[PDB]
Design a protein around this ligand. Structure first.
Ligand SMILES: CC(C)(C)c1ccc(Nc2nc3ccc(C#N)cc3[nH]2)cc1
Length: 302
């Protein structure tokens, strides 16, 4: 036939975009509306499927602020595909573009939005579990949500409230480590079941990462993943919050609060946001969405 890969009745699959994957994220086009989209692909032969249920997580999330719109899920050649709204570059891409350091203003504008974003996700009975700069993308120049920080990849998500019992998932240990070691919470390092508190702690680690330019456990290597994980964990525990957050009192207060939350406990999202909006106002900053990357030349697939 054609020679061209189609998804559903109107989505033309195009070049693969982004870094790493390996052909799992491709640019696409909606031939019917003449709009570009992002297409996530998973070989039907996959060992550990994640696509179809990530799709289900999106259905459960519904339409939300900062949540990419999902258009289709279906077979595509020897692939299973999920089609979503095309977005802009990730926070990691922007960080590199800004010489690997964000100003406090930029970081606070990011943190205020991400705390709300996480609260939205949690309000849908889901815990994220995959916090990292690569999973947060700004909108597209023009498509009016370019200043909005979006969250992607719910492949590692989990329902923390059992749909039938309506009870919080039970506490337990011995969970295998798979997530990204640089940002994960200390309790995650200990093999404990993750809950709402962990998503928040991970955000904190990321905030300090942006503010300092790096984290003090970032260069640890070992002979086995488990060994690398343990080392990073030991250093996180061995580094006092007052040292990690030197010169950023509010960041220390945030991190101390989340690190001390109980497993079943619902975080006080308003409290955490106010720590940052109070500081923001105190510094005299204006929440005008003028991040550090404003004015630069942004990487784009199209
Ligand atoms: C920096 C560069 C690699 C060119 C780049 C690559 C892709 C996008 N845009 C983009 N929109 C997306 C929507 C959903 C998902 C998922 N899951 C990934 C995306 N990536 C923006 C910039």
């Amino acid at each position: 036939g054609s020679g061209v890969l189609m998804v559903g009745p109107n989505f033309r699959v195009g070049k693969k975009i982004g870094c790493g994957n390996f052909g799992e994220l491709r640019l696409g086009k909606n031939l019917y509306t003449n709009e570009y989209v992002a297409i996530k692909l998973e070989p039907m032969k996959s060992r550990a499927p994640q696509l179809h249920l990530e799709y289900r997580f999106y259905k459960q999330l519904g339409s939300g602020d900062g949540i990419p719109q999902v258009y289709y899920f279906g077979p595509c050649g020897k692939y299973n595909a999920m089609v979503l709204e095309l977005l802009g570059p990730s926070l990691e891409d922007l960080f590199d573009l800004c010489d690997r350091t964000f100003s406090l203003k930029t970081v606070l504008m990011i943190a205020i939005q991400l705390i709300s974003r996480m609260e939205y996700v949690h309000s849908k009975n889901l815990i994220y579990r995959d916090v990292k700069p690569e999973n947060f993308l700004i909108g597209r120049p023009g498509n009016k949500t370019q200043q909005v920080i979006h969250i992607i990849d719910f492949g590692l998500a989990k329902e923390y409230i059992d749909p039938e019992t309506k009870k919080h998932i039970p506490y337990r240990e011995h969970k295998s480590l798979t997530g990204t070691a640089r940002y994960m919470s200390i309790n995650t390092h200990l093999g404990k079941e993750q809950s709402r508190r962990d998503d928040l702690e991970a955000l904190g680690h990321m905030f300090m990462y942006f503010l300092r330019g790096s984290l003090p456990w970032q260069g640890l290597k070992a002979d086995t993943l488990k060994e690398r994980y343990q080392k990073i964990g030991d250093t996180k525990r061995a580094t006092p919050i007052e040292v990690l957050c030197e010169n950023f009192p509010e960041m220390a207060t945030y991190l101390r609060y989340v690190r001390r939350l109980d497993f079943f406990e619902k975080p006080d999202y308003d409290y955490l946001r106010k720590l940052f909006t109070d500081l923001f106002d105190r510094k005299g900053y204006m929440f005008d969405y003028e991040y550090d990357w404003i004015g630069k030349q942004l990487p784009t697939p199209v």
